[PDB]
Amino acid sequence: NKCDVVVVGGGISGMAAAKLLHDSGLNVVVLEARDRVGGRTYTLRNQKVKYVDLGGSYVGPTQNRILRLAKELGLETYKVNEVERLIHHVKGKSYPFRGPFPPVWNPITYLDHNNFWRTMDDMGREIPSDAPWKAPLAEEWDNMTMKELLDKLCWTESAKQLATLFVNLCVTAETHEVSALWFLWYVKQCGGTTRIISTTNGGQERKFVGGSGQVSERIMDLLGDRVKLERPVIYIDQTRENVLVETLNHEMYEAKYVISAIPPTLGMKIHFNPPLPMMRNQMITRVPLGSVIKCIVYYKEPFWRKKDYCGTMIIDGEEAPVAYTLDDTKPEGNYAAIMGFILAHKARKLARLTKEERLKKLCELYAKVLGSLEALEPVHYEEKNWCEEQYSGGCYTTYFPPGILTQYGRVLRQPVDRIYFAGTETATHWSGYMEGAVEAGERAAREILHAMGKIPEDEIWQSEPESVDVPAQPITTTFLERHLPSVPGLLRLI
């Protein structure tokens, strides 16, 4: 019944918070709705795949908190394969390339593409990571969708198509679904365009040996019976001396404080006494999660490597079910596999099909893009549609429709009496990622330590030393990238 702090949710954020509080000598209890920990991370094990991440997987340079936590728990990383060429498939043809951005040959299209990426970072520089609503043009940018912004910025259909794929892949949502201010914040708070899109030296550089699920699992191992599985929280009462937290399976927990470590909208599944303040009451109805099916097709060998392809495919257009792939082969070179995402509206559309039907569509696509009949002979298939999850709401993360971030953004991590807010959505660096989950969980934990008078105010937010195993190299630009005119810039010069 009784403890110091109840943590609602046993994903990476809830586990990170619970570990910090436990290590500080407090009695913690984690209440998890599912029969497993990990949340939006999930590692499946079987003989065919050995292990596979069906949820969150990638980590990379500048994500120092998740790297430090995993290392402490005994985990190692390996590099996602990017030795050979990437492929950009456009208008039914594959164009192999090297470097993070797909190249453009037409001079007008070149200027347009260059300007788009540059402008994304230009705008981001005016958006505070810890308060995007304080951007000088916050209201103007929040009142526009990404579709509207792209319509203004992109003078070529080539740039608009790639920009659209970029948005879809980053946030699993349509350009017309999301606020421009929120999306620009999202990219900036991951370190900008290059950092977020890059495998080598970016967010997709590495995976955990044995799977990312091990982070939450190994913290559960430490905490023992402090983690309560199949305990969905239904009710939180703050009217009395101690906070009371009730679960669906009829149990009552009593604590001094609570950490909410669930997606913001899933706060709706809890009945509150007293009611939430007006702003949070409405906020949690305004913040949906994106839509994605993660699909992994297995092959006898990583045959693409023989053609000097690394397995990365960037596939434009409405017809293709999957817009982006990476090589998912094990470090040993076995369990050869291609990972692909079915994104946003396509997740909704293709969910109607059978698993076997999706497999056929993916294999035929891969055969076309890789130019190999070997793609038509899969040995195994795994997939997960995150849209179906009651206790996630979607993946990868929460997006903000136009008008919401400026009106409600301030209340995301505002404490409600003795409830403090974790979850990757509340992070200021790599929000949306496993890194953000760690940042937010540890910060919420320290807010409580401060409330108990155990630490000073200046220790609530804490810097992280850089990983020695995954060091970051600087992001650079060329003179031409910095100074070439936009399309309208070249027109005004003429």
Ligand X SMILES: *Cc1cc2c(cc1C)nc1c(=O)[nH]c(=O)nc-1n2C[C@H](O)[C@H](O)[C@H](O)COP(=O)(O)OP(=O)(O)OC[C@H]1O[C@@H](n2cnc3c(N)ncnc32)[C@H](O)[C@@H]1O
* Residues at the site binding ligand RGZ, with contacts judged by CB under 6 A: 58, 102, 162, 165-166, 169-170, 196-197, 203-204, 314
Does position 56 bind ligand X by CB under 6 A? yes
Count other C-beta atoms under 10 Å from residue 346's C-beta. 19
Looking at 434, 444, 448, 470, which residue binds ligand X (CB under 6 A)?
434
How would you label 75-110 residue by residue, b for 16+ Cβ within 10 Å and e otherwise? bebeebbbebbbbbbbeeebeeeeebbbebeeeebb
Stretch that binds ligand X, among 137-145, 258-266, 276-284, 360-368 (CB under 6 A): 258-266
Q: Which is nearer to ligand RGZ, 196 or 245 (CB)?
A: 196
Buried/exposed 430-442: b ≥16 CB within 10 Å, e otherwise: bbbbbbbbbbbbb
Which of ligand RGZ, ligand X, a copy of itself, none binds 278 (CB below 5-8 Å, type-dependent)?
Answer: a copy of itself
Supply φ then ψ for residue 270, to 5 degrees.
-110, 130
Q: Is residue 55 at the binding interface for ligand X, with CB under 6 A as the rule?
A: yes
Residue 386 binds to ligand X (criterion: CB under 6 A): yes
Q: How far does Cα 169 stand from its chain's mean position?
A: 10
**CB 102 to ligand RGZ: min, Å:** 6
CA nearest neighbour of 361 among 300, 293, 424, 309: 293
Q: Which does 39 bind (CB under 5 to 8 A by kind): ligand X, a copy of itself, ligand RGZ, none?
A: ligand X
Options 43, 189, 265, 312; binder of a copy of itself; rule CB under 8 A: 265
Q: Which of 169, 229, 234, 484 binds a copy of itself (CB under 8 A)?
A: 234
Output the smallest distance, CB 400 to ligand X, in A: 16
325 binds ligand X (CB under 6 A): no
User: Which amino acid is it at 50?
Assistant: K
One symbol per residue from 272 to 301: x for binding a copy of itself (CB under 8 A), - otherwise; what is it?
Answer: x--xxxxx-xx--xxxxx-x----------
Residue 277 interacts, among ligand RGZ, ligand X, a copy of itself, none and using kind-specific CB cut-offs from 5 to 8 Å, with a copy of itself
Residue 235 binds what, of a copy of itself, ligand X, ligand RGZ, none (CB under 5 to 8 Å, by partner type)? a copy of itself
Axis crossing angle, helix 434-451 with helix 12-23, rounded to the nearest 10? 40
* Residue (265 or 397) nearer to ligand RGZ, CB: 397
Give me the half-sphere count of Cα atoms (radius 13 Å) on the Cβ side of residue 431: 26
Q: Which stretch binds a copy of itself (CB under 8 A): 201-209, 295-303, 384-392, 420-428?
A: 384-392
Single residue of 33, 167, 320, 412 touching ligand X by CB under 6 A:
33
Shortest Å distance, C-beta 491 to ligand RGZ: 26
Touching ligand X, residues 436-455 (CB under 6 A) = 437
Number of Cβ within a 10 Å radius of residue 450 = 15
Q: Which is nearer to ligand RGZ, 170 or 342 (CB)?
A: 170
Q: Is 57 in the site for ligand X (CB under 6 A)?
A: yes
In the complex, minimum distance from the CB of residue 58 to a copy of itself, in angstroms, rounded to a whole number: 24
- Nearest approach, Cβ of residue 166 and ligand RGZ (Å): 4
C-alpha span between 257 and 29 (Å, rounded):
11
- CB distance 17 to 30 below 8 Å: no
- Least separation, in Å, of the C-beta of 71 and ligand RGZ? 21
Q: Quick check: 75 binds ligand X (CB under 6 A)?
A: no
110 interacts with, out of ligand X, ligand RGZ, a copy of itself, none, CB within 5 to 8 A per kind: none
Taking the least distance from each CB to a copy of itself, the nearer of 42 and 309 is 42
Sign of the CA dihedral with 248 first, then 239, 416, and 401 last: positive
Work out how close the CB of 170 gets to ligand RGZ at its nearest, in angstroms, rounded to a whole number: 5
Here the tokens at position 397 are 């993360």
- 397 near a copy of itself (CB under 8 A): no
Return d(Cα 57, Cα 490) in angstroms, integer: 42
Q: Which is nearer to ligand RGZ, 166 or 421 (CB)?
A: 166
For position 124 contacting a copy of itself by CB under 8 A, the verdict is no
Among 3, 86, 315, 395, binds ligand X (CB under 6 A): 395
Instruction: Enumerate binding residues for a copy of itself (CB under 8 A).
Output: 143-145, 147-148, 174, 176-177, 232, 234-235, 248, 265-266, 268-269, 271-272, 275-279, 281-282, 285-289, 291, 345, 348, 351, 385, 387-390, 393-394, 401-404, 407
Instruction: Enumerate binding residues for ligand X (CB under 6 A).
Output: 8-14, 31-34, 39-41, 55-58, 232-233, 261-263, 266, 269-270, 292, 294, 386, 391-392, 395-397, 423-424, 432-435, 437
